[PDB]
Structure formats: structure tokens, C-alpha cells
Amino acid sequence: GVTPVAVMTKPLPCPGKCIYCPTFAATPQSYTPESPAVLRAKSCEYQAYKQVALRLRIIQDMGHPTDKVELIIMGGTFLSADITYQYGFIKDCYDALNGVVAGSLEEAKTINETAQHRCVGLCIETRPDICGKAEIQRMIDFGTTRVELGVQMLDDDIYKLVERGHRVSDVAEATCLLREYGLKVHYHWMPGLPGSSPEKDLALSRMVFEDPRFCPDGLKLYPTMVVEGTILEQWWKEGRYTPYPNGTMTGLIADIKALVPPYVRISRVRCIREPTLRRLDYPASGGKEIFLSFEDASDTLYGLLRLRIPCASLPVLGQKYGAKTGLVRALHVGGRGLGRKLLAEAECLARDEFGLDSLAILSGVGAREYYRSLGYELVAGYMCKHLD
Amino acid sequence: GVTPVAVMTKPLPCPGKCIYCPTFAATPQSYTPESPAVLRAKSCEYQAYKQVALRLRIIQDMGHPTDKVELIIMGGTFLSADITYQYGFIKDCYDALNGVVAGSLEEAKTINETAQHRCVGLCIETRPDICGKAEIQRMIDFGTTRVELGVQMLDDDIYKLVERGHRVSDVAEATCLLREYGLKVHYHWMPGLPGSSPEKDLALSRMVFEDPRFCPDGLKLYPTMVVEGTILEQWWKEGRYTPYPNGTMTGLIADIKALVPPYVRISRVRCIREPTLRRLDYPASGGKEIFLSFEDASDTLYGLLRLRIPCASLPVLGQKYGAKTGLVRALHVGGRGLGRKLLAEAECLARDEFGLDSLAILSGVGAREYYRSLGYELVAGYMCKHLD
Ligand SMILES: CCNC(=O)CCNC(=O)[C@H](O)C(C)(C)COP(=O)(O)OP(=O)(O)OC[C@H]1O[C@@H](n2cnc3c(N)ncnc32)[C@H](O)[C@@H]1OP(=O)(O)O
Ligand SMILES: CCNC(=O)CCNC(=O)[C@H](O)C(C)(C)COP(=O)(O)OP(=O)(O)OC[C@H]1O[C@@H](n2cnc3c(N)ncnc32)[C@H](O)[C@@H]1OP(=O)(O)O
Ligand code: FES
């Protein structure tokens, strides 16, 4: 029951230095120019406060709730701009949610912990090669809870729809780091990219879900299509690219959804979307991932929890919570008890089965109060508990 | 007294996968379209045999000698094409020099060891990121003796005149490998690139000659200028780039030439171009470089020898020449005795001062016979001697 508030960043230059590169970097929304959010963003001159305020007005006019919100920074190039711009943009978002201006970002965050519109999640689109330790540290300062990597398709010989492009190595290194810091990892997935087949697309889709370097929490399926007035259109006119027949495409995405394991949230534009407690383990980036969930005999999902046994404790946790610290990466229950039941199970598994010294939860600022009522305390952006 | 025979490779696609990239990769000759060799290359449909044959006819018509030749493969993208194309292109070159067709590349090489037109050197333009162990191994099969890296300018934030561009890391890794295999290393150098200053250009030029990761054997100075009908021209029209004033440029290249150490061959488009034996040492890519030379009281250069004490013996030398092997990377004497005198000194320094087990010389095929007359024997493309 979380409402998404998606805003765009201002057009930025290409992160890489190249005279062949375009003036402005390529965004995932370059081939979706008619999305309401994109159209609104342009109308507001890409102002953070103006966008969030306007989007709250639309949601309220529709009669939808706004007490639980997930901010979504769209662009994929956000983390490569001026540091002043990044923090300023985020600070604007929280101010709009709070309805009051603060003196700094951290003040706005702490204010949102108890405001009408809780920011229980904050997602940031970024690219595989723009997602290192430096970039991740900033996302913690923003209160980030989820990341969408512009993977698009998993092969270094398939043309990506952005400038330069990335390597598979960059995807694995970013995915590993994101997990070691307690973040959600979602991949942008778009079959039909130049230099690929319906076979290769589906092949790579099976690999990513049975390859420990990857195995994301969800996919955002972007069916590739020739939007007019774009580079890809030039290739269509020139016969250098031919889209998958409409019937073919609808068939391919269907096969993709079937491959997906149970722990994966398929997003679009078997999958996620009395009950008993279910458990599912799988390796990922060296460590172990534990997918807890509440489901009934009909296999309908009621709530989930993502517990990770990490390889290392990269977080800069306090002196008491030293080494041997586990990470609760997610906890969604779309409201009577399932929450604490799931969190209680994860605590024991970390103490009894893996002998971990404590747990840490990279929660959203608007959800911190929830974990406070269960014995957790804020430490360097994380909600922690000694766990005995 | 070596005659250069410069030929171009066929237009190739961009090594990297990018929809923004151009149709054909960018070459160093894209901003020098009026060079005789470029104009001839287009006229011959970029055929290797046709180019080399025609160039031999021109040189003979001018009355210049052709008994000593250096082949120069121009393009910078050669090593990224079909392996069949690469070996075929090289094999064509040797056939034209020999005046006779052979059954394979190796047969053409061995034939050129004794032909009228000796191929005493073979240079290949390549890019910093297209110069790994795999790429270098092929260049040995071709009989390569020198490499020109498209460094252009040494900063990851300066726009290069090719697509994608490279990092400084790629330049250091390529330079290290090239040295460990006994090759000459020359850098393409062009001040005036978008996003730079006459100050930054000269600053970086001082660094490269006092930084162990670099210190090339020579620079090929490409004064940047706005050739009509090019990307850079678009930037000039759009005021996004302004060239260095003509007077400024001539001044900057002058300051560059003064910085240069004594071991460096400044090429254009203190520097190189009775006598006693001179010695000069300097670190480079972990190992040690020894620059021997014959010069007189007036400091006029008569001949040089480049001896390297490598960190490791990456070459795949025979069983007798095991570890502890030195590399003679160059030996030029622009003809009574200086040659063997220089080579004798290097042999002793390798045996007495550095206790090396043997020496190896990555000579050109047309020069192998020279080293045979001094006790060296061919082994995996190198001319080797046990050295006792
Ligand atoms: C990736 C993590 N994302 C989030 O936590 C934000 C989305 N939140 C949710 O999906 C679910 O509300 C939760 C994960 C918080 C679990 O809530 P659920 O009701 O299913 O289980 P619980 O047994 O813990 O009951 C929730 C209690 O905390 C309250 N609560 C719900 N959300 C919040 C919140 N963000 N902050 C503080 N309190 C909350 C509820 O009001 C309730 O208390 P109440 O009955 O007195 O009103
Ligand atoms: C990077 C290395 N590049 C090369 O070796 C190719 C360019 N060659 C040169 O610059 C010079 O000719 C050399 C490096 C070979 C040194 O020659 P230099 O005459 O100065 O010293 P030397 O005392 O060794 O005398 C050279 C002898 O070898 C002969 N010679 C010269 N070049 C070659 C050659 N490529 N192959 C076989 N023999 C040669 C000469 O004819 C002479 O013998 P000769 O007097 O009976 O005719
Ligand atoms: S155009 Fe900048 S990398 Fe292809």
C-alpha cells in the first residue's frame, strides 16, 4: 500500500568524455517520452520541490493515500552530477513531503520520520558503471532503500540504449556492493536491443536468475520499440534494426515471467503480485540470501522479508555492533502481525543458525519509527539491534 | 637510413558497442585527410598489396633506397578486426616487399629475411585499450617492432578525438606490457584537445617523462586543428571549442621539445635527430631501462641501443633461455662498427652487472640476418643468445 512519487532529474551531460557522445546523456525515459511523469517533469523545469508537490496534489485529487510514499529519482545519471545538486535535489524532495522547509538534508530526513507523508522508500535509477562505494555512500545519506541498475540486457556485445554502454563486470561489481550495503537491487530489462535475438534474450534471462553474481530482486521489463525521433528510429529507417514482431514480443515476455524464481518482483511498463511461513535460500555475490514469506495453500503472497548473510561487514556500524552483522534488505506486507512475525524469524536465524552479532536494516526515513517500536535504533542510516 | 612504407587499413566499425557511436571508427588520420598516404589508400580501396607495391614504385621513382623499409600499419583499429583480416593484411604487405607470393605469413617472413627490400621494422598504430596480451601476441606473429599508442593527451577528463576514448590506466597497462615483450613504445601527442589548456598540455608533458608508468621512447606530435567536415568543426561553429592561436601553438610545441629527456625520439607532423659510449638509466613499468648511445663532444647522436631489465620474463622463450632474460628493444645506427660495439656493451651489462641468463631481441624479419652474424638465433620471433 505504498504510493510511488516519481520525479526526474535535470538533463545532464554525458558522464563520459567523448566528442561523438550526445549533448545530454541518454535516460531510460528517452524512449518513453509520453509517460505522465516525464511530461510533467519538463513542464516544471525539472525542479524537485515543484515535481513532488504537484505529484502529491494529483494523488490526493485521485483520492489515493499519501501517508506512505516511495520516492523514485529517474534519470540514471543523477549520481554523476554536482554533489551540491544531488543533495539539494534530495533535500527538496523531503521538504515537499514534509510540507516544511528544513536547514539541511538530515533535518528534513528526521522531520519526515514523523510527518503525514512518510517516505518509507527511496529508489534511484543509476547505471552499472556509476555505482561504486563512493556512489553508494551518498545514497545512504539520502535515505535510499532501492536501486534500479540500467542493465537493459546482459551481454557486452548487445547495444545498450544509452551512451558508451557498460560491461557485465560493472553489473556484478555494482550488484555485489549494493547487496553488501543492505539495498534492494532491481535490473532494467529490455529485450529487442540491436544485436540480439528472442533466443539470446530468453537465454540471458535464465542465466541471471541462476548465476550467483546476479539474481536480482526484481526486473523492470522495458519492451523495446521504435519511438519516433530517436537514434533507434534512424536505424529502423536504415534497416540496421528491425523490432521483434508484436506477437513475438508478447510471447517472449511471457516466457521470461515463467523463468523467474519465487523471490523476484517482476515490474512491467509465479512472480510477486491461513498463511504459513516459507523459507528459500540462494547464493548471491558470495554471501547467502534468505527469502522469507507468508503464503497460503493457494500460494498467494501476503508478505516477504529479504535477509542476507553478507561476506563482509562493509557498513560503518558502531563499536557495539562490530563484525558479524546481518542485513535485512526488505520487509513488505501489503496489517495485523505479519510484519513482526517475519522480522522475529530473521532475528533468530541470524543469532542461532548463523551466529551473527547483530542485525542492521537500511530502512526508509518514514519507516524508521516502525523499527524503533521493535527495539531497533538508528546508527549511520541503519536501524540496528544487538540481537541476543 | 630506413625508408617508411605507410599503408592504411580498411574502414572498420567502432570496436565498442554503442548506438551513439559513428558508423566507422575514428582514426588518427580522420583529421589529416590530405596526407598522401591517406589519399592513396582510398584510391586503392585499402588493399594492402596494392598500397605497398604503389609506395615502393613512388620511392624508387624518387631515387630513394628501398633495401631497408619500415612498414607502418595506420588506423588504430587494425587489431580489433577479424583475425583472418589481420593476418591476411600483414601477409599481403610482406608479399609485396618480397616480390613473390608465399603460402603463409611465416613463409613470407622467412623469405623477407633475405629479400631485396628488407622489412627491418614494422609499426602498428593501436589504441591504449586495444593492446593487451592477446593483441601483443599477434603483433609478434606479424614481426612487429614498434607500436604507436593513441594516447593523444594524458588525462581521463580531456576529450579524445576517437570514439569512446580511453583511460590513463589503459595507457600504463599497455605501456608496461609492450615493454615486457621487447617492443618500442611511442605515444601520439596532440595538444589543443577540447577541455584543456596550453598549461595543462605542458604540465602533462612533463609528467609523462618523469613518471615510471610512462616515459615513452618517442612522441608523434599532432597539432590539433579544425579540419573542415568533422565533429570538431561542428564544435567550432557552435563555440564549444576554440583552437589555440597559431602563435600560441608553435610556442607550446617548442616548450614540449625542451622538456624531453635524451632517450626520446620526437616525431612531428635535445630530442633525437670521435664519438664515445654514453649511458643513461631510468625506471619504467617497474623494470629498468638503459639507454646506450654514441655521441661526440658536440653532442651529435651517432647510434643508440635500448636495453631493458624486465620485471618478469613474459616471453615464451625456449628451455635453455629460461628465466633471467634481458630485452634489447632498439638498435639504430644512422655503418662501420657502432652496431656491434653497442650490442657488445649491452651483453656484458646483462651478464656482469645484472646477472641475466641471456638476451632476446624482437628484431624485424629483414634484420634477423644481421643478428645471426653476431651469434643470435631465432626463437619464437626473438633473436636470442645464451650470453656467457
Ligand atoms: C522495505 C520495507 N518497507 C516498509 O517498511 C514500508 C512499507 N510498510 C509495510 O509494508 C508494512 O506496513 C510493514 C512492513 C511496516 C509491516 O506492517 P504490518 O501491519 O503488516 O505488521 P505489524 O504487526 O508490524 O503492524 C504494523 C504496526 O505498525 C504501524 N505501522 C505501519 N507502518 C508503519 C510505519 N512506516 N511506521 C511506523 N508504524 C507503522 C501500524 O499502524 C501498526 O500499528 P497499529 O496497529 O497500532 O496501527
Ligand atoms: C631497431 C633495430 N633496427 C635495425 O636493425 C634496422 C636498421 N639498421 C641500422 O640502423 C644499422 O644498419 C644497424 C643497426 C644494423 C647497425 O649497422 P652498422 O653498420 O652501423 O654497424 P655494424 O658494425 O654492425 O656493421 C653492419 C654490417 O652488417 C650489414 N648490415 C647492415 N644492415 C643489415 C641488415 N638489416 N641485415 C643484415 N646485415 C646488415 C652491413 O652491410 C655491414 O656489413 P658489411 O660491412 O660487410 O656490408
Ligand atoms: S558516442 Fe560517446 S561513446 Fe559512442
Residue numbers in the entry:
A (entry chain A), B (entry chain A): 10 to 278, 311 to 314, 330 to 390, 394 to 447
Please, what does the article write about this entry?
Elp3 acts as the catalytic subunit, but the loss of any of the six subunits results in hypo-modified U34 tRNAs in yeast, indicating that the complete integrity of the complex is important for its function. The enzymatically active Elp3 subunit of Elongator contains two functional domains, utilizes multiple cofactors, and conducts a unique uridine base modification specifically found only at the wobble base position of tRNAs. The two domains form a cleft that contains several highly conserved basic residues, which bind and accommodate the tRNA anticodon stem loop (ASL). The current model of a radical based Elp3-mediated cm5-modification reaction is proposed as follows (i) Elp3 recruits SAM and cleaves it to generate a 5’deoxyadenosine radical (5’-dA) in the rSAM domain, (ii) Elp3 hydrolyzes acetyl-CoA in the KAT domain and (iii) an acetyl radical is formed by the products of the two domains and (iv) is transferred onto the C5 position of U34 in the bound tRNA molecule.
We successfully co-crystallized DmcElp3390–406(GSGSG)/E386A in complex with desulfo-CoA (DmcElp3-DCA) using similar crystallization conditions as for apo DmcElp3. DCA binds to the KAT domain of DmcElp3 in a similar way as acetyl-CoA is coordinated by the active site of GCN5 from Tetrahymena. In detail, the two phosphate groups of DCA are in close proximity to the glycine residues residing at the start of the blocking loop. The rest of DCA, including pantothenic acid and β-mercaptoethylamine, are pointing deeper into the predicted binding pocket. Furthermore, previously identified conserved residues, including K77, K193, and Y441, are involved in ligand binding and in close proximity to DCA. The β-mercaptoethylamine part of DCA was not clearly resolved in our densities, presumably because this part of the ligand is flexible in the absence of the missing tRNA substrate.
